[PDB]
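Try this one yourself first.
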């Protein structure tokens, strides 16, 4: 029934902290969330441990969510947020559709999976922002979600009115041209947004990655099983829109294979 993953043991806050690794590059965000908790020393693993099941990671997470004492804001809601988190807890192992909005980097269509993040105080961000410098598209896309833009693009193909068939393409364009779901305007907004040395989760091309700002740059944790052995390789810059990027030790210093 369950999947296995290997554990990179790295020195974090000068203490031998575990992290979870995956070559598969799967869409499920269990590892993205979990890695954060491990870093935050909320979940501790026996030094010796080499491998971990989903069923373990899950149970560790369950305990964590149920262990959250409230702290005032949503009060009836908090209890529903827990029950919501708890009910969609299994869907985390599997994989998760994500309807992004293009309206800003913390903007998604709510699914009850969002409740897990909200509870653990983990921000979720995406890179796919429409550029106000293309007001043609800004207007065409408007305050609309991704899976919604597709519905409407299709609606617009078949529409008689050629005001729509024009916008139907004005949008078909914006997606044709932003295929890697991280526009420049995205990166800028996303960097500015994310708090200095705060652990967040970064969504893009149906993968979840663990994020932080550090000395006003964005780095992502190095989940790639590929560098299992390499204690020195932990953060990979998200400095460029696409291309090349420098690896670093847990202190955000350069490191080489």
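Now uncover the answer:
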């Amino acid at each position: 029934e369950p999947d296995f993953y290997c554990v990179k043991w790295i020195p974090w806050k000068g203490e031998q902290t575990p992290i979870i690794t995956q070559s598969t590059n799967g869409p499920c965000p269990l590892l993205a969330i979990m890695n954060i908790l491990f870093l935050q020393w909320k979940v501790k693993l026996p030094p010796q441990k080499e491998v971990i099941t989903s069923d373990e990671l899950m149970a560790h997470l369950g305990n964590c969510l149920l262990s959250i004492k409230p702290q005032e804001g949503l009060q009836l809601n908090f209890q529903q947020n827990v029950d919501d988190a708890m009910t969609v807890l299994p869907k985390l192992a599997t994989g998760l559709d994500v309807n992004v909005r293009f309206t800003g980097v913390s903007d998604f269509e709510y699914t009850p999976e969002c409740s897990v993040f909200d509870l653990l105080g983990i921000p979720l961000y995406h890179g796919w922002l429409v550029d106000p410098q293309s007001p043609e598209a800004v207007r065409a896309v408007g305050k609309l979600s991704y899976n919604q833009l597709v519905e409407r693009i299709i609606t617009c193909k078949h529409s008689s009115d050629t005001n729509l068939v024009t916008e139907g393409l004005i949008a078909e364009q914006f997606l044709e041209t932003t295929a890697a779901q991280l526009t420049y305007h995205g990166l800028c907004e996303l960097t500015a947004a994310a708090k200095e040395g705060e652990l967040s989760v970064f969504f893009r091309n149906n993968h979840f990655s663990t994020m932080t700002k550090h000395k006003s740059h964005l780095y992502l944790l190095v989940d790639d099983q590929g560098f299992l052995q390499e204690e020195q390789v932990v953060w990979e810059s998200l400095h460029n829109v696409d291309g090349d990027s420098c690896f670093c030790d847990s202190d955000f210093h350069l490191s080489h294979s």
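Discussion: Residues 162-176 form the longest helix (15 residues). The chain has two domains: 4-128+181-248, 135-176.
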